[PDB]
Design a protein around this ligand. Structure first.
Ligand SMILES: Nc1ccn([C@H]2C[C@H](O)[C@@H](COP(=O)(O)OP(=O)(O)OP(=O)(O)O)O2)c(=O)n1
Ligand SMILES: [Ca+2]
Ligand SMILES: [Ca+2]
Ligand SMILES: [Ca+2]
Ligand SMILES: [Ca+2]
Ligand SMILES: [Ca+2]
Length: 903
DNA sequence: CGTCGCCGCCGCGCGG
DNA sequence: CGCGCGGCGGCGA
């Protein structure tokens, strides 16, 4: 096989590399790497090295890496550019793997661990590590085993050995319900004392050194606790055995709310799963405890136990160990579904970076662009210093607040990356500038043509047309990858709806699910067989369809994130290729393109309908337009349609056969006007929305910019078995809105769009009646706990104190001087509740850490002094009033002359 | 060390 | 709670 790296580090003048050799053996080597950097040289001296502008460069080969660094400093003192890759490990990887990396994940050691630390005096601070480590479960991906290190004797209690037999048993048999599929994979090791536990763990680690190290909060907790505890017991040299090169760095993260210290283990790539989840899941969660994320992702119930975790080991050691094993497995299960490790390894090897650098698109693109340029013997420019400067972004149209019955949306494929490709925006393709006219003059095609030679954006920039820049070239490759995976995702989605349809008529038999590839549209043979399957098999197929879909979603959306981050990076001062002319060229073009096509679409439909001045486009944001289809439906008449699916086919055909060709023509003209290199403005139909035929539903509504709801029947080719609510921006989509309120507001919207005014008033009335029975967590608001100290004036709210911060301070006073109580962590999330006047807490609100039941100390008083009326008004009624007034509805029945005839 | 646009809640200081 | 500005948090793109 072709060799690939595992990890790479620079230590002084050595490169330390772990890698997989041509036989699939893990190896390590130390190389005295001789780096090269570059200087501009006279036009009249032979060289094969040129900077990106075509200026000749001389290569300077250095005796060692320190010399190279010191030369960079001298070139600064002199005032001349030091060109080339100044991150020497990236240049090493590029020299060593001068080919597309083919990696074998089965040779990479992925380690997933969690630790337990009993602590009576509150949270066990990793930097202190003053409490014994009493459990480690370490899963190894190569052995496929859960190694459990269990401490039997501790100053906090002596316990009996854990029992795998009891752990396997159902909770109803008194067992711990450890999933049977891993029971055979557990290697259990009990220990008489902590010292031997840690010594054996270190020896284990040495034999089975993690390449990728993951888990839940391992970066902020497990890793530093283990490192510091070993350090405190044995000394630094022993702690440093966690690094395969015996080098660690104790270094803080420079934030704006305080400071926390993480431990950098040279020769390991730490991918804390929480950080992977936060960057790649496209969620914002009320809580980031593993219980909460597990239940969301997997639908598994919380781990239930009695008393505080600080007493769990001594009261129930059996469960303590089992829950530690289960926590590890749960991360693996989340990964089996989301596939973030896979994504990371894919991006990492593609860019040729340290795997942990996937968190940094700037580092990712810097390496991609450097490898691409190096292939042509080109030299990257030195990074420069820039002041942070604001710049303009996308265009958003002000919608007329209203209900909208029939709506077709259109959307541009990868807008910003397509603009980069269409215009040829790259650092080395800049050709000059033209005299800009006001934007609406380009929008309305009255401005003079920018250039007869170069490719332009309405911000004034011109670009070469003879050859593609490295930014367009490289953004295209990843764009193309994205498209493949999106194709897989959409097909899995369409396949899911076929299974849903079949579930309405399940057969009564014993059978198996079909062995099919869910990434491809089902054949007719597969479709027929599905129609003959039981509910059990169809459900299992649906589960697999939905899993295939999620896999495609991870792969496609994060590739989209990466390419959109390149466009963004152009506006970040730390990007080597930072240039505001280029960032603005993208965003201004976008503003033009959206408003241009609004004008064209209107002009087209006005002509089609025989009118003048009618606004068919009701809304637009960045790259999408929303078109009123009322008149189109009306031109044939509703009475001519058999059912909903009929008008949906009607609009699907109108959008694809009439609108898209006109939209294409409009953009082709814009490309010529701007003289662009390639026409890549592809606007396809996205959504078809409307009320169920024969119903009183309103179909959709907007309340303002970025706030709207639609009843969707078809979304980019997927015909739903059941209509789907597309809701953007409204309170149902916000993590800050109480769970029960999101649910209830959603049903109100469902009722408005699908059923009408009368059904809406039925639901509201009932919800207002029963509201007070709701569980307090389901009705608590959520917020982030930022800058608590800033607004803490001796335990009481300072000036301008935010509502949620007040709640935290109320909380802090109520738990004051209790070590056992959960502390609110700066920057983490809190549940928030209003309090009725005259409550013992002495303030109007209280906040506690999210994902948790509030400490038993104050729970009773919170539930008794909870202000339901305020709660109902603030989070439910006000947003609903917002929806209904925008939609011209009433949530409460207005009095009529019909009152009353019952007498 | 990917980006900007813009929403609603809140405290504040009005607003004769 | 009528009004706007600035802090904030958070979402849409
Ligand atoms: N995080 C993001 C998301 C969006 N945008 C910009 C770039 C996008 O091109 C444009 C529209 O975003 P979309 O959500 O519509 O997605 P794309 O058009 O990029 O891709 P696609 O529509 O094919 O999924 O907005 C951005 O700058 N940063
Ligand atoms: Ca735990
Ligand atoms: Ca788009
Ligand atoms: Ca699309
Ligand atoms: Ca059937
Ligand atoms: Ca869009």
């Amino acid at each position: 096989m072709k060799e690939f790296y595992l990890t790479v580090e620079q230590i002084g003048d050595s490169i330390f590399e772990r890698y997989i050799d041509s036989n699939g053996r893990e190896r390590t080597r130390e190389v005295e790497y001789k780096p090269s950097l570059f200087a501009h040289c006279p036009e009249s001296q032979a060289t094969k090295y040129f900077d990106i502008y075509g200026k000749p460069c001389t290569r300077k080969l250095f005796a060692n890496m320190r010399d190279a660094s010191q030369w960079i400093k001298r070139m600064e003192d002199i005032g001349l550019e030091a060109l080339g890759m100044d991150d020497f490990k990236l240049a090493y990887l590029s020299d060593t793997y001068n080919y597309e990396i083919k990696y074998d994940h089965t040779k990479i050691r992925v380690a997933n661990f969690d630790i337990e630390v009993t602590s009576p005096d509150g949270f066990p601070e990793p930097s202190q590590a003053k409490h014994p480590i009493d459990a480690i479960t370490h899963y190894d991906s190569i052995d496929d085993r859960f190694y459990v290190f269990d401490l039997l004797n501790s100053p906090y209690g002596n316990v009996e050995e854990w029992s795998i037999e009891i752990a396997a048993k159902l909770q109803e048999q008194g067992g711990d319900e450890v999933p049977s599929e891993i029971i055979d994979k557990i290697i259990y090791m009990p220990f008489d004392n902590e010292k031997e536990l840690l010594m054996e763990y270190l020896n284990f680690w040495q034999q089975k050194t993690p390449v990728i190290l993951t888990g839940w909060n391992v970066e902020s907790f497990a890793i530093p606790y283990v490192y510091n505890r070993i350090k405190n017991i044995f000394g630094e040299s022993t702690a440093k055995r966690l690094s395969p090169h015996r080098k660690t760095r104790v270094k803080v993260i420079e934030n704006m709310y305080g400071s926390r210290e993480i431990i950098t283990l040279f020769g390991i790539s730490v991918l804390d799963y929480i950080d992977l989840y936060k960057k790649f899941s496209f969620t914002n969660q009320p809580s980031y405890s593993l219980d909460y994320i597990s239940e969301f992702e997997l639908n598994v119930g919380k781990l239930k136990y009695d008393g505080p975790i600080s007493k769990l080991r001594e009261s129930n050691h059996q469960r303590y160990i089992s829950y530690n094993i289960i926590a590890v497995y749960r991360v693996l299960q989340i990964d089996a579904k989301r596939q973030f490790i896979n994504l990371s390894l894919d991006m990492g090897y593609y860019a040729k970076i340290q795997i942990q650098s996937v968190f940094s698109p700037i580092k990712t693109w810097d390496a991609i662009i450097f490898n691409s340029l190096k292939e042509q013997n080109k030299v990257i420019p030195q990074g420069r210093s820039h002041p942070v400067q604001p710049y303009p972004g996308a265009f958003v149209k002000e919608p007329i607040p209203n209900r909208y019955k029939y709506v077709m949306s259109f959307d541009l494929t990868s807008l910003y990356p397509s603009i980069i490709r269409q215009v040829n925006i790259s650092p080395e393709t800049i050709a000059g500038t033209f005299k800009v006219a006001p934007l609406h003059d380009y929008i309305n095609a009255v401005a003079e043509r920018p250039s007869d030679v170069y490719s332009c954006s309405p911000n004034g920039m011109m670009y070469y047309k003879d050859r593609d820049g490295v930014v367009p070239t490289e953004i295209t490759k990843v764009f193309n990858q994205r498209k493949e995976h999106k194709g897989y995702m959409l097909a899995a989605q369409r396949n899911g709806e076929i299974i849903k349809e079949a579930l309405h008529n399940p057969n009564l038999s014993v059978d198996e699910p079909l062995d099919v590839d869910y990434r491809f549209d089902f054949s007719d043979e597969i479709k027929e067989k599905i129609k003959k399957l039981s509910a059990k098999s169809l459900n299992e197929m649906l589960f697999r369809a939905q899993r295939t879909e999620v896999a495609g979603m991870t792969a496609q959306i994060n590739r989209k994130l990466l390419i959109n981050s390149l466009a963004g990076a152009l506006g970040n001062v730390w990007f080597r290729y930072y240039d505001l002319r280029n960032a603005t060229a993208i965003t201004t073009f976008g503003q033009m393109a959206l408003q241009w096509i609004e004008r064209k679409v209107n002009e087209y439909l006005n002509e089609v309908c025989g009118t003048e001045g009618e606004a068919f486009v009701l809304y637009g944001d960045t790259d999408s337009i929303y078109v009123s289809a009322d008149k189109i439906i009306d031109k044939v008449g509703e009475s001519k349609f058999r059912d909903t699916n009929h008008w949906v086919d009607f609009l699907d055909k109108f959008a694809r056969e009439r609108m898209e060709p006109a939209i294409d023509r409009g953009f082709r003209e814009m490309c010529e006007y701007m003289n662009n290199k390639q026409h890549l403005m592809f606007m396809d139909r996205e959504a078809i929305a409307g009320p169920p035929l024969g119903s009183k539903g309103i179909g959709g509504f907007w309340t303002g910019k970025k706030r709207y709801a639609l009843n969707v029947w078809d979304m980019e080719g997927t015909r739903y078995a059941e209509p789907k609510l597309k809701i953007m921006g409204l309170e149902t989509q916000k993590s800050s809105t109480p769970k029960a309120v999101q649910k209830a507001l959603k049903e109100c919207i469902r009722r408005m769009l699908q059923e009408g005014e009368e059904s809406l008033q039925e639901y509201f009335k009932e919800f207002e009646k029963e509201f007070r029975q709701l569980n307090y967590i389901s009705i608590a608001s959520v917020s982030s706990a930022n800058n608590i100290a800033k607004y803490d004036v001796g335990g009481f709210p300072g000036p301008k104190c935010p509502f949620h911060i007040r709640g935290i301070l109320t909380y802090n006073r109520a738990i004051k001087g209790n070590i056992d109580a959960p502390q609110v962590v700066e920057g983490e999330k809190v549940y928030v509740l209003p309090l009725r006047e005259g409550n013992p807490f002495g303030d109007k609100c209280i906040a506690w850490p999210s994902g948790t039941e509030i400490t038993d100390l104050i729970k009773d008083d919170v539930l008794h002094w909870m202000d339901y009326t305020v709660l109902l008004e603030k989070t439910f009624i006000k947003p609903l009033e917002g929806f209904t007034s925008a939609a011209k509805l009433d949530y409460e029945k207005k009095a009529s002359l019909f009152d009353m005839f019952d007498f």
